[PDB]
Amino acid sequence: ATSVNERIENKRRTALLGGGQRRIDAQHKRGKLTARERISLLLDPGSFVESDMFVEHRCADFGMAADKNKFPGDSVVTGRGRINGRLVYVFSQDFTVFGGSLSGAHAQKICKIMDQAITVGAPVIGLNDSGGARIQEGVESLAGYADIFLRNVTASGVIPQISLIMGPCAGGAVYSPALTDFTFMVKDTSYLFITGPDVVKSVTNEDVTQEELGGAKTHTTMSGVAHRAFENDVDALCNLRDFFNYLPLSSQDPAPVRECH
Amino acid sequence: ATSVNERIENKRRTALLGGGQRRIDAQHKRGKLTARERISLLLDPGSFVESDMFVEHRCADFGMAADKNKFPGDSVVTGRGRINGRLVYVFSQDFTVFGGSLSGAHAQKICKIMDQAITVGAPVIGLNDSGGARIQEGVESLAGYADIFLRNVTASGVIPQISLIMGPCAGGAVYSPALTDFTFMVKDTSYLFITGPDVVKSVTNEDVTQEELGGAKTHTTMSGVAHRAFENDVDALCNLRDFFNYLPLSSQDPAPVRECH
Amino acid sequence: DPSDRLVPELDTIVPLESTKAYNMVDIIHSVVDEREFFEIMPNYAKNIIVGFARMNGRTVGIVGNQPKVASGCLDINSSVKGARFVRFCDAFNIPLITFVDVPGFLPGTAQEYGGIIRHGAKLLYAFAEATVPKVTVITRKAYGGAYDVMSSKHLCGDTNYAWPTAEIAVMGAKGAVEIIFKGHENVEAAQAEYIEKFANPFPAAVRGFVDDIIQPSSTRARICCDLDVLASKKVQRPWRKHANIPL
Amino acid sequence: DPSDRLVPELDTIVPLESTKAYNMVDIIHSVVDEREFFEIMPNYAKNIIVGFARMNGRTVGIVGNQPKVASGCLDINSSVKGARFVRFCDAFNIPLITFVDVPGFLPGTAQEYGGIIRHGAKLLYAFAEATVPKVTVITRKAYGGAYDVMSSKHLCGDTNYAWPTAEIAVMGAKGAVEIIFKGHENVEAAQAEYIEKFANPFPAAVRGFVDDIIQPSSTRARICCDLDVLASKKVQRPWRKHANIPL
Amino acid sequence: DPSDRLVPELDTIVPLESTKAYNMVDIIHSVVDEREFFEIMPNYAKNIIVGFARMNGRTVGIVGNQPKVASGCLDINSSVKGARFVRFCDAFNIPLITFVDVPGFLPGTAQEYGGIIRHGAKLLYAFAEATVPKVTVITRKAYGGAYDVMSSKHLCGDTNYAWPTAEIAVMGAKGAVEIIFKGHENVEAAQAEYIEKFANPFPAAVRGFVDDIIQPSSTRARICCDLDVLASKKVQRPWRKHANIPL
Amino acid sequence: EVDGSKLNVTSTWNLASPLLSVSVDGTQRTVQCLSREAGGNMSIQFLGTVYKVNILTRLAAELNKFMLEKVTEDTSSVLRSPMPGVVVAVSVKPGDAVAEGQEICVIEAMKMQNSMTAGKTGTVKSVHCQAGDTVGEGDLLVELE
Numbered sequence A, B: 001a002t003s004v005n006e007r008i009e010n011k012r013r014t015a016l017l018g019g020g021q022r023r024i025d026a027q028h029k030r031g032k033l034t035a036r037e038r039i040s041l042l043l044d045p046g047s048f049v050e051s052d053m054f055v056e057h058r059c060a061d062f063g064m065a066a067d068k069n070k071f072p073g074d075s076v077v078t079g080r081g082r083i084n085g086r087l088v089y090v091f092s093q094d095f096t097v098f099g100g101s102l103s104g105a106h107a108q109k110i111c112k113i114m115d116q117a118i119t120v121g122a123p124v125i126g127l128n129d130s131g132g133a134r135i136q137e138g139v140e141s142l143a144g145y146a147d148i149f150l151r152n153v154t155a156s157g158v159i160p161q162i163s164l165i166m167g168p169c170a171g172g173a174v175y176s177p178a179l180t181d182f183t184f185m186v187k188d189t190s191y192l193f194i195t196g197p198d199v200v201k202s203v204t205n206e207d208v209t210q211e212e213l214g215g216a217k218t219h220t221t222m223s224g225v226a227h228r229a230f231e232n233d234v235d236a237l238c239n240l241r242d243f244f245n246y247l248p249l250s251s252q253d254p255a256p257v258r259e260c261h
Numbered sequence C, D, E: 001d002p003s004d005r006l007v008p009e010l011d012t013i014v015p016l017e018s019t020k021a022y023n024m025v026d027i028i029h030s031v032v033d034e035r036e037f038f039e040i041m042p043n044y045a046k047n048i049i050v051g052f053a054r055m056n057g058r059t060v061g062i063v064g065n066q067p068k069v070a071s072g073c074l075d076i077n078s079s080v081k082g083a084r085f086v087r088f089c090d091a092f093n094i095p096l097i098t099f100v101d102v103p104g105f106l107p108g109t110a111q112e113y114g115g116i117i118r119h120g121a122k123l124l125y126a127f128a129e130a131t132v133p134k135v136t137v138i139t140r141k142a143y144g145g146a147y148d149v150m151s152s153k154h155l156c157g158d159t160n161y162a163w164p165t166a167e168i169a170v171m172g173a174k175g176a177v178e179i180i181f182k183g184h185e186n187v188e189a190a191q192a193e194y195i196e197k198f199a200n201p202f203p204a205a206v207r208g209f210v211d212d213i214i215q216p217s218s219t220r221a222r223i224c225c226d227l228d229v230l231a232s233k234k235v236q237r238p239w240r241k242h243a244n245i246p247l
Numbered sequence F: 001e002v003d004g005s006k007l008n009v010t011s012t013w014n015l016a017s018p019l020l021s022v023s024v025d026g027t028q029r030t031v032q033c034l035s036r037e038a039g040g041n042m043s044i045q046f047l048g049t050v051y052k053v054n055i056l057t058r059l060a061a062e063l064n065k066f067m068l069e070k071v072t073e074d075t076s077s078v079l080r081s082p083m084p085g086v087v088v089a090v091s092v093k094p095g096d097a098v099a100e101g102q103e104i105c106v107i108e109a110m111k112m113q114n115s116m117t118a119g120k121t122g123t124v125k126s127v128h129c130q131a132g133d134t135v136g137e138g139d140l141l142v143e144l145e
C-alpha cells in the first residue's frame, strides 16, 4: 500500500493547528488572533491561496533536528488573495511556534511571495508578530533579514507595501516595517523596539515598561514611526481593508477611480 | 590566546591539499592534473584571485555531517584571473573529493562567479571534471543544476562561455557544457554521456566500452557535440589560451583587433 | 466551460504500481475547456504531447510526457519537437502548461551517437528562456536532469504543483542505495528507510520546490485561477542581439 | 601581414575541369594573416570548413565549402555546424567571410528521412539574420537553392565577388537542357549554346548579383579593404522577443 | 602610491581583547593613497567616519565605524550622516569602501523616542540601493541587524572581506546562551563550546557570506584589484519614478 | 641564458615575413619559421636545416611529467610508399615471408625507377599494393609480422 496520503493529511492538520491548541489558547488569552484567522478576516471569503505550506527549517544543531521542533509552515503563513476583487499578496507571522522568530524557511517564503508580487505587479501586505531572529538558527537569520530588506528596497516605488504590527516585534524584525510605505499598529498588544527593557536597564540604568518603551501610543504620538493605531485586531483589519481601496496596485496604474453617487 | 589563526592556517593547508595527497597521487597516475594546477597553467602567473575558499557543504544525511568528510572548497575551485591581460572568470571542478560531484555549495560557488562575470561583462571558463551529482544530498543537487542551467541560458549571447571537459562527466554534468558556446575535450581521459555503460547493458542489453560510449573521438567525429580534442591537459590548456585570445570579452564589445607585422 | 469545475475522474487515473502506464491525453482532455485539444505532430515522437487548447477562453500551449510509449523517456525527436513548440509559444505570448511524468532520457548508443546532449540542451534552453507564464504539474515521477529539463521551479517557473502520487528524486532507489551503501552489504531495511523517506513529493515540498500538493480533482480549478493572475507577468533580461541556442 | 599582400598562387588553384577537386584550406590559409587558422570541428562534417582567423589584426569567422569531401555538397551535419558557428559569430560582432563552391544538397533517402529540409533551413536562417559584415567570394560553382543558402547578395549581404571560374545557375547544363528543350530533340547544339551563354558568371554579373569579377591574386587585398569600411555597419530590424529558428 | 603596497602595521592594530578600542582613522590612513583623507563631518556623530579618498588614483567614498567613540555603536545622527553620504556617492558613480566594527545600535529610551528605527532604515536603504561597486572589510565584529545595515554581501554587495579578528554573530555570546540554554544551568561548558564554535568568522565564511579571510597587511592590495575589475559593473532594476525613502 | 651561456639576440622581430634576420653576439643569421603550434612545437630552418623544437614554460614543463605518453601502433612491421608515382609491378603477395633488403614493389616517379625493400624480417599479413596502381606518398603497402 501507499502511506503518502495519510501523512499528507497529518501535515495539513499540523499546519492548520500551527503549534498545538495550548499555544493557540495562550494567543487568545492575550486578546490576539492567530495568523490564519487574521488572513481569513483580511481577505475576501473563498479567495486565499497558500504558498509553501509544507516547508520546515533546515537547522540541525542545538537539538533543532528533533521531530518535536519541526513545524510545517515554520512560523509564517504566506499566500495571495483578493480585497474587494483586487489582487494582493499577504504574509502573516505565526507567534504560535518559536515566537514567530525568523528562520531560513520563513525568509524564503516571504522572499518568494515578494518576488511573485513584484513579477505580477500587486501590493504586499504584511502582518507582523515576531520575537526577532532564531538565535540557534545561526547567521542564516541575518541572511534572511538582509534578503527581505533588499527586496523591500527594490520594490519601493514599484508596488505599495503595507505593514500592520499585531504583536511584539524586537530585534531585526523592525527594519522591514520601516522600509514599507505605511505602518499601522494595534493598541495595547503591539510593540516596536530595537532592544528590550531589560537591556535598557542593564546598560543605561533606567527602568521602563514595554508599553512606554515601544507601545502603540509611543510610536504614534512621539516618535513618528507608525502612521495609525487601532483599537484591536478586528478593527485594525477592517480599517486596513478600507484603506487598501485607496491605493493603486502598481506604479504603472493610474489612481483608482470608484463610482460616485 | 586566540585559537582562530592556526585553525585558519590549517584549513588553508587542507584546501590547497584538496582531498589528501593519496587521492592527488591516484589522480596523477591517470595522466590528469588537479584543478589548482590546471588554473595555474591556464591563467597568467600571479593573477588568480580565488573566491569562496572556506565554503563547505551543508548536507547532514547519511553520516556526512562527520568531520571526516567536510572538505573546504567542496569539489570546486572558483575565481578570476587574466589571460594576456584580459579579465576572465574561471571555475575548475575538483575530482579529488567525492568524484567532483556537485553539491549546494558547489553550485552556489559556480553561480556566484557566473553572476559576478555577467555583472562585470567577462567570459566564463569551466574546467569540468565531475562524476555526476551527490546522491546523498538529494534534490539540492537538482536545484543546483537547474540554477546553473538558468544562468547559462541567461548568459547566452551576453558573454562567451567556454567548457573544457578534462575528466569523466556523467549524469547532469553534461547539459551545462552543451549550453555553452564552445566545448573542448581531452583525448583518452575525458568522457561525456548521460548514462554509463552498465546502465546501457542493463537496459539495451549490448556491450559498449567507456571510450566508445563517451570518449573524445566519439563526440568529435560522429556526434557533433565537441568542437576540438587535444592530446593532454597541458596542450589543451595552451590551445584554450590561444583560442580565448580570439574572442571578445562581451557582446557589447567590437571584435578584438591585434597588431599585424 | 466554468473555470471552477471539478475533475474527479483524475483522482485515480495514476496507477498505484510504477510499472503500469496511463494516457496523459486523457488528463489533458479532462483539464482543458470543452475537452478540445489541437495536437501538433500526433504521429511523430509520440513519447511527448504538444498542442494548443483553451483555459477560460484563453489560448494555452500544452507540453506533457506520454508514459504509454517509451515509458515517457525523452530522446532526440521528442526533445526537438517540444523545444520548437515551446519556443513558438513563448515567442507569441502564449501561456504554457506542463504535465511532468518522466524517468529520464532514453539509454542506448544510438542516442549517444545522435547527439542526445544537444537536443536535451535544446529542450532545456527552450523551457528556461521562456518568459510567458508557465504552470507545471507533476503527476507520477520526475528523475534526474529530466526533472530540470521539464520546466522546474528553478528555471524561473511561476507555479509548480505535485499530485499525491508524485515523486522527485535524483534517480531510482536501486541506484541510490547501490552508490551510497556499499559496506553495509545488507540492503534489507535500508531500502525501507530510503523508500519511505524519499519516494514521495515530501522533500521537494519541504525545500519549497513545489508550491503545494494538490488533489487531482481540483487541478483545472487550480490552474485557471493561477492562469489569470499571471496574465500580467513581466520580467526583464540582459540585452543581447540574440542568444546562441545549442542547435 | 600587410593588408595589400598579393596571393598569385590562387590564380591557378581552381582546375579547369569541373570534376577534379581542390582544397579550400589552401585558399583560406593564403587569404588570412600569417596563414594561421583555428579549425572548428575539423574531423566532423568535413565537407564544410568553419573557423576563426585574423584579417588586418581583427578577428574574422570563416565558413567555406570543401570540394574534397562529397564534392562540396551540403548535408545534415555540415548545415548544423555552419549554422551554429555563424550564429555565434553574429552574436558577438565577428565579421564573416564565405567561400562558395557548392553544386547543391546531397541527394538520397537517408538525407530526406533525416530531415535535410530542417537543417538546410537552419543554415539559411543562420546567414539570413546575420547583421555583422559578411563578405562572400564564389570560386567555382553556385547551383540552385544552395547558392541562396551560402550567403547570397539577396540575404542583405554586403559584398559579393566571383572568380573568373565562378558559375551561377539554377542547375547544371544537363537538367536545364532536358527541361527547356525536352521536345526539341536537338540537344547536340542546345548544349553548345547553353554552355556558351549561361555556364559563366556573366548572368549574375549583368543583373548585379555580384559586385565585381576579381582576379584571385587580389582576393585578400580586396577583403581587408571591405572590412575597413564595413566595421561601422548598422542595420535595424523589427522588434521581437525572439524568432523561431527551424530547429 | 603603488597599488600593491603592503601595509603591515595593520597586522596588530586590532587589540586581542574585545573590551579595548582602537582608531579606524588609522586604518583608513594606512589603506588609502598617500595616506590622504578628506573627512566629512569630522566633529559630528564621531562614532561613524565618512569621507573621500583615492585608491589607485580613482576617487572613492569611505564609510567606517569608530570603536573609539561610543564603542562603535550606531545611532540617529550617525545613521543620517552615513546615509546621505552613501546616497551622494551612489548618485555620482563613486565606489564605496566600508569598514565594519559595530556591536549594534545604542539602546535607551532617548533613541526610541527620537525614531532610531527610521534612521536605521535610512542607512540600510542607502547601502541597499547602491549600484556603484562596494567593497566591505570586517575588522573586529558585526552583531545583529547592524551587520546587515553595514553593506553585507546579501545587499547586492560586490566583495566582502573579513580579518582574522572578525566576529559575525547573531548577538552577544552571553545573551545567546541565556536565550538558548535556559534550564541547562551548566553554562560553564556552554560558554566554551559557543565561543570555540561561533566567536570567529568561520560561520560566515563556511556559507560564502564573506569572499575570503585576508591578512590585514594585504588589505590595500586586495581592494585596488577589486576596484580594477568592478569599474565596469552595470546592473538593471525595475522601472519607477522614484522610491520611498524612509525619511 | 642557455645553460649558463649568455647571448644577445637583436632583430626587427617581424613575425609575418617568411625570412627573419637576427644578430646573435654580432654574428648575423637568417632563419625561417616553417611551423608553429600553441603546444610549443616549432619547426625552424636554420643554416639550411629544419630543426624541430618544443618550447614550454618551466611550470608547464614540470607539470608535463605527469602526462601519460600515448601508446602508438607504429611498431614497425609496416612500410609506406616513398614514391608518390605509379607502381609497375609488385613482387610480394599476402602470406609471403620477407627479410632485410628484400624488394617488395617496384614503383617509379618523375623520370626515376625505385624498388623499395623490406627493412626487417617477417611475414606479410595483407598486401595493399597491386601492379599498375597509382599510389601516393606515405601510403601503406605491406603489413609484415
Ligand SMILES: CCC(=O)SCCNC(=O)CCNC(=O)[C@H](O)C(C)(C)COP(=O)(O)OP(=O)(O)OC[C@H]1O[C@@H](n2cnc3c(N)ncnc32)[C@H](O)[C@@H]1OP(=O)(O)O
Residues within 6 Å of the ligand: A098, A099, A100, A101, A130, A131, A132, A133, A134, A135, A142, A145, A168, A169, A170, A171, A172, A173, A196, E144, E145, E170, E171, E179
Ligand atoms: C538581527 C537582530 C537580532 O539578533 S534579534 C535576537 C532576538 N531578539 C529578542 O528579543 C528575543 C527575545 N525574546 C523576548 O524577549 C520576548 O519573547 C518578547 C520579544 C518580549 C515577546 O514578549 P512575550 O509576549 O512576553 O513572549 P514570551 O515571553 O511569552 O515568549 C514565548 C516564546 O517565544 C519564543 N521566542 C521569542 N523570540 C524568540 C527568538 N528570537 N528565538 C527563539 N524563540 C523565541 C521564546 O522561545 C518563548 O518560548 P516559550 O513559549 O516561553 O517556551
Ligand SMILES: CCC(=O)SCCNC(=O)CCNC(=O)[C@H](O)C(C)(C)COP(=O)(O)OP(=O)(O)OC[C@H]1O[C@@H](n2cnc3c(N)ncnc32)[C@H](O)[C@@H]1OP(=O)(O)O
Residues within 6 Å of the ligand: B098, B099, B100, B101, B130, B131, B132, B133, B134, B135, B141, B142, B168, B169, B170, B171, B172, B173, B196, C144, C145, C170, C171, C179
Ligand atoms: C542529476 C543527474 C544524476 O542523476 S547523476 C547520478 C550519478 N551517475 C553515475 O553514474 C555514478 C557516478 N559515478 C560514475 O559515473 C563513475 O564512477 C565515473 C564518474 C565514470 C568514475 O570513473 P572511475 O575513475 O573509473 O571510478 P573511480 O572509482 O576511480 O572514482 C569513483 C570515486 O568517486 C566517487 N564518486 C563518483 N561519482 C560520485 C557521485 N555522483 N556521488 C558521490 N560520489 C561519487 C565515488 O564515491 C568513488 O569514491 P571512492 O574513491 O571509491 O571512495
